[PDB]
Design a protein around this nucleic acid. Structure first.
Lengths: 81, 96, 21, 105, 50, 183, 29, 462, 88
RNA sequence: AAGCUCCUUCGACGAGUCGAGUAGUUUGGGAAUGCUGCUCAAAAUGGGAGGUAAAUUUCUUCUAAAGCUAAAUACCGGCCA
RNA sequence: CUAGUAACGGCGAGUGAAGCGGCAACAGCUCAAAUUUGAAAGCUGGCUUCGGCCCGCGUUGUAAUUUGGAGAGGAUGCUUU
């Protein structure tokens, strides 16, 4: 299950800073001499929690080793509800 | 007559101008300051960017003057702006 | 200065005024 | 002093003023008690004294003043704690009906 | 008494069908990125100036 | 919303999960030094609402101080002395605030948010360059932190007549003899 | 029991009820 | 007469001219003169005969004549039993006083109570209210209503039926009485309507009965229709019906104006021409669209049950009833006839849900014959992927769908025939899927004694 | 009493400081379920289940310090017991 | 980028902290005047403080437990005059 | 000024404020609590021909928006850089 999930998520990895700067240069040059919405793996505790509350998340993958554990304790129950 | 008996009726002369006031023998300095405040000043009209102008020009070259279709078009209006906004920008661009 | 304070001062600065006698 | 005199008395502490005077009745229902002696202070100066029968019985409110408690070294007397006392009442207490219900309470 | 009792799901047993928020979605969640528009404009100014 | 979920979880302190976490942690802190640096804050919600930012220049320092009394009672708080000791260790920093993390029966544990005033990020950012200013040296020693204000009674009302705007300054103002020129 | 065509089908106490001294309503517990 | 001979203000006369009304109806003819004279009036009138203008003219006339401002207060209050009726009166109000300087507002059940409180505190001179929310505001929110000069009650029979007797009794008690002009309209004259008249109207009111005693009664000659479909495919039925019988005449009755506008613009995107008629359109263009549909041989038009009431239905091949009727009785008896009119022969259809079989039970009781219509899961079209894409992509469709869904849920919850159309049996996931949502939007469905406790004997409460 | 025309003032959000936040209630209930109960709350639950309502209220008053606090704690715990029963 | 306006949409506000008990100290101030120590330890149409005998605890007035901020004020010390 | 008043005191020695009112001076604001999520947009270094290049910090949250006599979001039409 971990391998299959990570295969899909690697298909949907976000972009590196070098890649984003490279794209921005592409459009800057194109303007110097109309796109579809990006799809990305959402990360960030507050962002993911808000997505769960507003029921836009289709899948949640939660790390098992967070240092102040309180930051993820409510997450399984929240997802269940 | 105060039909409703409201005190602010003998006081009159829901949006108001927010940046100025529509305001309506004697000392030299007072007259000088009054004429200095009343002197007519230039306004420096704001321009539209070249990309904004070409955007509006493409909109008009495709649809003409039908602002409903210009607003509903997704290819030429990526930002899903309203017909009233597009019409205002056309008028301020000077091409109806 | 903060950007919000900069905007507030840009759009609503201290104006010159005189009051008659 | 009154609670020391009363051997069938449960002493309780401060009662919320923003609460309800019948929230007092269910408080008395907690301690299986059919009589309530309620002390209510106003401005921290003036006492008000309530005598009540908790379930349905009548209640009476008095304004309490002129208070010289014990522990005052001019009484020269003392008595047993909890002994059954002799209750002395008045002809007015027997004649006026409101004084009669006060006497019963 | 049970020193370590099992948890009874008295609240998460009921699945709610609606988001917690009734707030409206902003326009920017449906239109392209104004921030990248601004960044690309800054880059175009830099390219034009050399 | 995780911050608010943690706020409620920290409101419930004798709950089973919070109690287990607090026990295991008091063991950890007691095995560590009396004053030692924290990287991540243990209660991120409390740190955020007290003013902690994940910037370069913000540090946490956790401290344990012995509890009890001197029958005499110390007028400043155990939190105040913990703040003062943390600042004395990190003399080059400014004590922004502190918060409670654990109690124990022998000690009391606090985490102190400290800000570096000589850091370029802190100096560039407003809303913290005020603590970069030099009038804010050793706020914990002068009683200018939240504990200091609580102990000094800096509240408005008729119950704080003697203590607002300075107890000793008010005493001097009331016990000074004013003699005008034309009496 | 659908009597009329399109109208709706028409559909503890710890106290007893007595009268007050002022001709009012009284609850006896 | 007409409208000019009557001495009205120039602003209101020009506004009516822009609306496009020239010759008045009977209720207007007999109701405007005494209302402007100031006489308290009761009217036995039908809905759709022009009574909306008949009572909205004098209120605006007097508000403009004695110069209200938002700081003055509340002014004229008209109370109506249905959300869609409130919306119709509000649209008529905007189109009537688009030139005046007064303010108009609608406060209805199911809406945002805090937003309505803000509206009322800001100030509305022409308030249009549903009785329950109106009473809640008059008891709880702080707003100025001391300068209340005009009170209008619309469809008191429908109000007292729903069940707002106690509520109305408190509105007339709270609202001020001195120099107040009241305008009470009803279709029936029951004892409750009489009690209202006595409690509200001043002694000796002026009566206007523009009703017709020769009312035609229905017989065993009514044939009705039912298509039992799940909640998540009602729009798929509507789309398949319309696209297949594009060449016939179809009139579709919805529940709410927001639903009408959402489906109109959505069907524009999904590329099938439909004519539109709701409360947000101008009266002139609404009349033009109705006229062109009535004269055109083929087409499909969508409107609300209230519009169906207020308009004269032409000869039409298929009357589709999509959302549950406001007044169930009238649909099974009145509009069933309108379907078969003149020398022609029309057909009827009630979209029905597996949670609403009590409707079929009520029909057996009413002994009117009914024919069901199977639909082949093969001939159902599937445009759900395109629908979800459009709703998730275009922002305007998103708001339209949200408003239509909210209005549909509110109407379903506030429907009178609760035993049949109870909201708690709906599946909100399926309803939102039909409207085009992968997840349902957030909506509010709803919108022993103390020991020793004794009754409420006086005090300084407020 | 100087007769002055009273004015209707607008609603104040500071006066609206009363908490009717549905999301806050949701968060509180979920955190209650996740975290569990204190030892004194567990004793109150035991008393509430075995029927010693008066003992539960008195114990809650002793632990908290106010009759209203005891009443609200007992009501919260009783509704928790009812929710647990229904969920089972 | 910004101010206003309007509304069939929303509107998150600080916990070992309040509070109860107790000891010390302090204040003109046992509704504890404030502070600190120890035990127990909260709420959400909530909480704090006042008014009220007026019939129940009605009414009034503010939002604590995060933070910044010049001037009017002190000044036997510093640079002077 | 209130005022040696209220208040606490063997109602000893005594202790001892504050609201109002006149004046001086006046100035208001920042965070935590919301998802930028159609794009961490933020920032520390050190390499520089100075124009921009990389190391990193940071999603356990750095920018922008907002701080409850508020505000957000849409719409709308004027007004300001």
């Amino acid at each position: 299950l971990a391998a299959q999930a990570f295969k899909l998520l690697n298909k949907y990895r976000p972009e590196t800073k070098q890649e984003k700067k490279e794209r921005l240069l592409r459009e800057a040059t194109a303007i110097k001499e109309v796109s579809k919405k990006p799809y990305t793996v959402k990360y960030g505790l507050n962002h993911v929690v808000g997505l769960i509350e507003n029921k836009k998340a289709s899948l949640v993958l939660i790390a098992n080793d967070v240092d102040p554990i309180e930051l993820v304790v409510f997450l399984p129950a929240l997802c269940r509800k | 007559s105060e039909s409703d008996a409201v005190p602010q009726q003998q006081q009159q002369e829901n949006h108001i101008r927010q940046h100025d006031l529509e305001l309506e023998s004697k000392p030299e300095v007072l007259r000088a300051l009054e004429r200095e405040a009343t002197r007519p000043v230039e306004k420096t009209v704001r321009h539209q960017s070249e990309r904004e102008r070409e955007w509006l020009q493409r909109l008009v070259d495709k649809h003409g003057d039908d602002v409903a279709a210009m607003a509903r078009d997704r290819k030429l209006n990526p930002y899903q702006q309203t017909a009233s906004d597009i019409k205002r920008r056309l008028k301020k661009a000077g091409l109806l | 200065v903060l950007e919000k304070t900069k905007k507030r001062l840009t759009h609503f600065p201290q104006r010159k005024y005189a009051v008659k006698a | 002093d009154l609670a020391s005199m009363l051997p069938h008395g449960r002493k309780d502490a401060k009662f919320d003023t923003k609460s309800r005077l019948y929230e007092l009745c269910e408080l008395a229902e907690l301690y299986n008690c059919n009589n309530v002696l309620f002390f209510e202070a106003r401005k921290g100066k003036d006492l008000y004294m309530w005598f009540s029968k908790v379930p349905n019985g009548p209640t009476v409110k008095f304004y309490a003043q002129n208070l010289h408690t014990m522990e005052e070294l001019h009484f020269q007397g003392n008595c047993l704690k909890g002994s059954r006392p002799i209750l002395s009442f008045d002809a007015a207490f027997e004649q006026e009906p409101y004084l009669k219900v006060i006497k019963e309470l | 008494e049970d020193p370590y009792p099992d948890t009874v799901e008295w609240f998460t047993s009921v699945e709610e069908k609606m988001p917690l928020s009734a707030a409206p979605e902003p326009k920017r969640r449906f239109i392209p990125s104004k921030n990248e528009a601004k960044q690309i404009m800054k880059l175009v100014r830099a390219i034009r100036e050399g | 919303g995780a911050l608010k979920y943690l706020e409620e979880l920290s409101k419930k302190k004798q709950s089973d999960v919070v109690r287990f976490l607090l026990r295991v942690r008091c063991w950890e802190y007691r095995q560590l030094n009396v004053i030692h640096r924290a990287s991540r804050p243990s209660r991120p919600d409390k740190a955020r609402r007290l003013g902690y930012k994940a910037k370069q220049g913000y540090v946490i320092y956790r401290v344990r101080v012995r509890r009890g009394g001197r029958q005499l009672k110390y007028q400043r708080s155990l939190r105040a002395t913990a703040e003062e000791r943390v600042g004395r260790r990190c003399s080059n920093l400014r004590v922004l605030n502190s918060y409670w993390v654990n109690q124990d029966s022998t000690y009391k544990y606090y985490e102190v948010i400290l800000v570096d005033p000589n850091h370029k990020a802190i100096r560039r950012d407003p809303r913290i360059n005020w603590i970069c200013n030099p009038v804010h040296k050793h706020r914990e020693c002068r009683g200018l932190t939240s504990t200091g204000k609580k102990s000094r009674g800096l509240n408005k009302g008729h119950r704080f007549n003697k203590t607002r705007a300075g107890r000793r300054k008010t005493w001097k103002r009331h016990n000074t003899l004013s003699l005008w020129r034309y009496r | 029991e659908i009597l009329e065509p399109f109208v709706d089908p028409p559909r503890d106490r710890n106290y007893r009820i007595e009268k007050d001294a002022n001709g009012g309503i009284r609850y006896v517990y | 007469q007409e409208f000019s001979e009557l001495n009205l203000s120039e602003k209101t006369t020009k506004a009516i001219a822009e609306m496009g009304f020239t010759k008045m109806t009977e209720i207007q003819r007999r109701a405007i003169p005494p209302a402007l004279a100031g006489k308290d009036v009761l009217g036995a009138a039908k809905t759709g005969s022009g009574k909306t203008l008949a009572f909205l003219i004098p209120a605006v006339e007097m508000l403009s004549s004695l110069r209200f401002k938002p700081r003055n207060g509340t002014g004229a209050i008209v109370v109506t039993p249905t959300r869609e009726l409130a919306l119709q009166i509000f649209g008529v109000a905007r189109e009537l006083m688009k030139y005046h300087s007064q303010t108009y507002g609608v406060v209805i059940g199911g809406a945002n109570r805090r937003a309505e409180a803000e509206k009322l505190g800001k100030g509305v001179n022409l308030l249009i209210a549903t009785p329950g929310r109106l009473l809640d505001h008059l008891q709880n929110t702080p707003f100025v209503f001391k300068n209340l000069k005009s009170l209008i009650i619309d469809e008191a029979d429908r109000i007292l039926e729903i069940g707002f007797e106690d509520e109305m009794r408190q509105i007339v008690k709270i609202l001020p009485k001195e120099d107040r002009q009241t305008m009470l309209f009803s279709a029936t004259q029951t004892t409750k309507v009489e009690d209202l008249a006595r409690i509200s109207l001043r002694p000796g009111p002026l009566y206007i009965n523009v009703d017709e005693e020769k009312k035609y009664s229905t017989v065993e000659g009514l044939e009705q229709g039912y298509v039992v479909v799940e909640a998540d495919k009602r729009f798929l039925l509507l789309f398949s019906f319309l696209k297949k019988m594009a060449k016939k005449k179809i009139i579709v009755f919805f529940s709410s104006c927001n639903s009408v506008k959402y489906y109109s613009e959505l069907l524009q995107y999904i590329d099938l021409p439909v004519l539109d008629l709701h409360g947000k359109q101008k009266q002139q263009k609404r009349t033009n669209t109705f006229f062109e549909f009535c004269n055109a041989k083929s087409g499909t038009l969508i409107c609300t049950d209230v519009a169906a009431r207020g308009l004269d239905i032409p000869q039409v091949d298929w009357i589709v009833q999509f959302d549950p009727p406001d007044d169930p009785r009238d649909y099974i008896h009145r509009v069933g006839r309108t379907a078969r009119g003149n020398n022609g022969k029309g057909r009827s259809l009630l979209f029905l849900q597996p949670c609403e079989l009590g409707f079929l039970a009520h029909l057996k009781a009413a002994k009117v014959p009914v024919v069901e219509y199977d639909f082949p899961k093969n001939k159902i079209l599937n445009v759900q992927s395109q629908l979800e894409k459009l709703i998730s992509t275009n922002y305007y469709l998103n708001q339209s769908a949200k408003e239509g869904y909210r209005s549909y849920i509110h109407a379903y919850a506030s429907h009178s025939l609760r035993s049949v159309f109870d909201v708690h049996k709906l599946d909100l996931v399926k309803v939102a899927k039909s409207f085009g949502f992968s997840t349902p939007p957030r909506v509010d469905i709803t919108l022993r004694r103390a020991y020793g406790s004794q009754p409420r004997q006086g005090g300084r409460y407020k | 009493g100087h007769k002055t025309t009273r004015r209707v003032l607008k609603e104040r959000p500071s006066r609206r400081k009363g908490a009717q936040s549905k999301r806050t209630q949701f968060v509180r209930s979920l955190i209650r379920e996740v975290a569990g109960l204190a030892p004194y709350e567990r004793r109150v639950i035991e008393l509430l289940r075995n029927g010693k309502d008066k003992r539960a209220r008195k114990f809650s008053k002793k632990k908290l310090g106010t009759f209203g606090r005891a009443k609200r704690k007992c009501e919260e715990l009783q509704r928790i017991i009812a929710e647990s029963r229904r969920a089972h």
